[model samples]
Target: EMEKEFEQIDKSGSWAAIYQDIRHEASDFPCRVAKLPKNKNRNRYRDVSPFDHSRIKLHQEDNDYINASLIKMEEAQRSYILTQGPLPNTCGHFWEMVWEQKSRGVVMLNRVMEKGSLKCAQYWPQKEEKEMIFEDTNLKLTLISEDIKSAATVRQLELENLTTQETREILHFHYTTWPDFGVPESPASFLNFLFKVRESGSLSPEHGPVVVHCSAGIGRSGTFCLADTCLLLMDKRKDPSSVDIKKVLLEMRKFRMGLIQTADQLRFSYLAVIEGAKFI
Candidate 1:
């Protein structure tokens, strides 16, 4: 069944073609495209229909303990916080990310959940629901439904949440806004969204890291991370700085091992980051 779905996705040729179009259209930084992997077990699959109870339970316990520790850590001293990749299971990944945020006693006011071409009929979760079910964790997941119109707005909301008066230094995630869906989002539009976020006064020197991810945790996620880093450098130094592509690849590899599975994705990120700089 999964193979059949993947085949359908390939036949549609949306994500691949869209990525190519965008790569060529933008001339700032050369595109660094990465190839998609063959193994389905990696991180691209989505099974959000029938709830997995066992996984949810285990995750809940882990998150409970982690959150407790994070609370204690915050009381001692302020330090750099790191947000990691998505969890193993689809639902598990969702809640795990949420728990990680709450552990630091920070509330996430915005979230973006990117969906691919394939649709799951049973994957319906209420927009207002606070608790997500996956493995065993009852994670506090909040949805910014109003910000779903565009990729840029999603980024803006995250920044707003981060810089909101309630919490000036909070963590958030950009779920998925990659052009890899073969339907590339407008670079100008997306960059504009980022600009709004950066200017929103939510990102502070004290705020921890922002979490980013896509299905495989590479393609789109890599692009988002790279673009963000580039934006930060441009803001501070006013010069196009160099990013160690090899280092980014190595860090991703440390987590998923086979992350950023395609040359197309890597190149696409290169282009996107270069183009994203024009907004500044």
Candidate 2:
């Protein structure tokens, strides 16, 4: 059933039109949240608006805004905070959200700097660095450890609340080679990276939703979540054919528009989902 559609998407032909059509429809949404005064702190101009209905609302009591959304898949039992990479100004608020939401981890899908452009602010502490203090939020991040993988980096962060002196561990997973508006060269490689995250159990609901972000927080971040959700559902149902890529993509777009950005990304998701099903 999907082979013919796969051929279209993989060939970069009709699938291109199809994806644009869906994205266009998603744009009809009110986008009321984009008008929020507080969202201007996002890192990139082209990639930072959040949908009004689904966008997460923060209430430090004084302010109730953050450029982030809670994408919940009740049937799939997955919850993720889809957000843009932090801007210089929002770095402090980003940690505030992390601490307030009680998120156990964050998944970064882009390089900090890419193509001679600064994609995301260096939100966390740097390597071999002991700690980073965000005085604005009264939050401190201390590096606990780091593990370097071939295509990713896993870091342990200890977030301390200066006011309460309460501390929590934050797991950070960085996928190293993803390019701007593109899919990785190897789908299987990403799956291996995905498994490492799964092993850590960060994506589970037992913890707060795992935060997922890229430069824009849609494209690559969306693909990462879509691929994982589809593959996991396939495994649980014991039927690869049961999952619907278009439907899943559409559902995700309701949370964050322009997800699975291009034809190549849409196609790669199919390849990854199919490849991952084989292992299940």
Candidate 3:
């Protein structure tokens, strides 16, 4: 069904109709937690907030709210904690969420600066600072090593829980090439990066859900998760044709709102999924 629709849509030269339908289908849901007076400043975008049902609540007594959602794809045995770029004040809570969930890696699809605007805070320790501490969360991150590649930069960070005196290694995959509100130049580069992420075994079930974020944690983030999950399901069923891309996307939106922000993104998702399924 998806394959036919994909081809037909491409042949008809209009994905806007389907994209509009998806936007309509992803209609309003409850996001009361993100709208509270105290939590208003925690959100990066005023309009973009996580659904109350799936929002990731911190372990703190009076400060549990974070503009993030935990999305689960049961059939594919996959899960992701999708969130917006951290604000300066909420950076500590971002790391807190990381330590609490025991995530193995963070997939960042946006750069700190884009088009002369700051898209996300410099949450991690950079070259100048070897170690950074988040007093609010009682966590310290030390940059162990960094391997910069053409399309992405992979950093090895040691996360130390100050309270417990325990530490865990975290992989930070920063994809620096993708432009805001635009798809990659082609699927080859995107798929290659996705494969690189898969090779690390971070997305496996044994560890906690991989934290994925962009500016708002929905557009580029959603495209990445949708493509990854669909490809996994394709491999599991041994037939790529069995997967329904639209249905899978709708299933994911139950946990968060406004995924795949634009028609171009939705089209790119289908293209990427189609391209990735070739190997499986």
Candidate 4:
């Protein structure tokens, strides 16, 4: 069913139309909190704001707003904390959300710098045994180890909460090749990286939702979450034809605005989901 729709969309060159329809439907959500003058600098993109209802609020006494959202796909039994890459000042808030939410891993779909632009801050410590401290939030991130792979890098990090003197290990999955406004080269390599995350049990229900972020937190982050959720749904149903890609994308958009940002991304998502059916 889906494969036929994908072919029809491809043949007719209607991916852009499909993407626009979804964007139109997701446009009305209110982002009152993200627009406040006090919070303006917190957003990476003025156009990209988190809906107030679903935004992830930090544990700070005042000014607790952060450009992040909690995306729950209850039926798929999966949830993700979709968020923007941390700004230099907001790194503490990022780690605070991680510690408070009990998330075991962070799926970073973009790099620290991309195409002459600084896409994200160097939030985690880059050197082994070296630590980056977020004084404002009383949190410290120490680099434990790193495993470099062909398409992605896996870094082991230790996040410490100074107040309670508690620490937890966080796995940072960094996809190096994905461009700022593009999809990966192929689904095979992308799927390989995703399966590595799955095999680690970091995405299991027992842990808090895996924290996912790209530069703006909607495009690549959305694509990854959608693909992962759809694959899980397909596995549980034992029929790839039963999952609806459009419906799933729209549902995910309700939690965070502008998911699957471009037509190419939408098309890539379809291709990835279709390719993933074979392996799942």
Candidate 5:
């Protein structure tokens, strides 16, 4: 029955398949690479990535119930954190990275806020709401950047503060890469990067959940999440009562919706997870 369901999932390219494959063979996860359809007014710097907010809106509208259903499921999760593409140029129209610690879930939304902090009033979709999820102290936010900038500096400061005040810490990387589709470096290098982060002594379950995201909550975000979960599952194998792979997928889908958003993405993640297990 499970195999039949897996086959059914594989036949559909409607994003959910991406999550299913990762849940199965982590090492053989496939990459779902696709080019962002060209637009006449596309901005090279801001619109280069395929996982943009506008794209998601279009996807939501075109796909109908799938995205809506996923959103509902995502909300039901204890915690739902996700990353979104760059913010639009509007006062109350900023991108938000949210985390709800009590629920242990994270999510990302494309909207605007009066201030960067969650306490500020939110202007988009409605006005009564104030703040987004990223502001929660329990949810660590790591702005993606390769160089030292304001966001990176803030991240450093926060890291230092957390190290001083918290008993334990969880590290999350909001990673983005160029050329969106192809491997950034080799698969070995990517896995090595994750291994290095794990060895950095920054992650611990006690401080709360480590949240990762990228634009549209797919691609890089999905890959890293899949890899980390696979590694953690492997480590827990020593115990007779280990976590079930299918159960993990069912739970993860609640948080990230379609963790694997495309067929290639699914295949790549499965391969990556399996490769990581080889190390264990």
Candidate 6:
């Protein structure tokens, strides 16, 4: 049954039609988030436009006003906080959100530098750069350790609460090669990278919602979340046919805008889910 559905997608442009239909439906909502004077980014392209209903609002003291959205999957009993890559000025708000939300880890699917261009501001401290402190939020970030792998690198960071001098550890999962506006070359490598993030034990409910982001926090970010969610469902049910791929993507988009950006990314999502269901 799972292969039959995959064949239906491969038969024609059914997958493309479904995603465009989603974008069309999402367009009905007033996503004026980017238009808000207080929320615009210096680089207009890399910004999170929160839906009116589900925007991740900040505490009044959160001066930087980071752009982010909290995505919930009630059926799956899992959730994610999606936000754009930090801008230079928004780093304070970014860390502030992390602290306020008590997030334990971050899943970064984009590179700091993609094809010689800066995709995102260096949001974390460099190993030799000493601890980077965000004065606006009164938080200090010190890179504790880093483990490099072929397709990704895992970093251990220490977040210091200046007000209380309390320290917190955060896991950073960085995917190195997936290009800007692209999918992973193969589902196997991406799955292995994802498994590493899970093994860190940072994505558990005991921790704050995992913060997942790419350049825009939608395309690859959405793909990752969708794939992960479906795989979990497949595992629980022990049957891939029981998982509704199209229905799942639509539900995820209600929490954030422009998830599953291109047709290729949408198609790749199915491939990843199919491959992941094998051993789940």
Query: What clash count goes with each model?
Result: 30, 0, 0, 0, 43, 0
lDDT per residue for candidate 2 within 129-236, as digits (tens), equals 658899888999988988988889999999999999999999999999664546767687788878888889888777888999988888888888998898767767
Model 1, runs deviating above 4 Å: 1-93, 101-125, 129-135, 140-145, 150-186, 196-205, 234-259
TM-score attained by model 6:
0.92
Give lDDT tens digits, candidate 1, residues 168-226.
Answer: 22323232344434525446654554555455433334343333334343344445544
Model 4 residue 75 lDDT score:
89
Look at candidate 5 and tell me the lDDT of residue 99: 17
Worst 10 residues of 5 by lDDT: 64-73
For candidate 6, the 10 contiguous residues with the lowest summed lDDT are 39-48
Which pairs clash (backbone N, Cα, C closer than 3 Å) in model 4? none
List TM-scores for all candidates, in order.
0.47, 0.92, 0.96, 0.96, 0.45, 0.92
lDDT of each: 0.35, 0.80, 0.90, 0.89, 0.36, 0.81
Tell me the RMSD of model 2 versus the true structure.
Answer: 2.2
In candidate 4, stretches whose alpha carbon ends up further than 4 angstroms from where it belongs are 179-181
Given candidate 2, what's the lDDT at residue 220? 81
Local distance difference test, candidate 4: 0.89
Expressed as tens digits, the lDDT of each residue in 53-73 for candidate 6 is: 676666755333456778898
How well does model 1 score by local distance difference test?
A: 0.35
Q: Which tens-of-lDDT digit does each residue in 66-107 have in candidate 5?
A: 111111112222122333433332111122121113112222
- Collision pairs in model 3: none
Better structure of 2 and 4 per lDDT? 4
Cα error, residue 279 of model 1, in Å, equals: 2.3
Residue 216, candidate 3: C-alpha displacement in angstroms: 0.3
RMSD of every prediction: 13.3, 2.2, 1.5, 1.4, 13.4, 2.1
RMSD of 6: 2.1
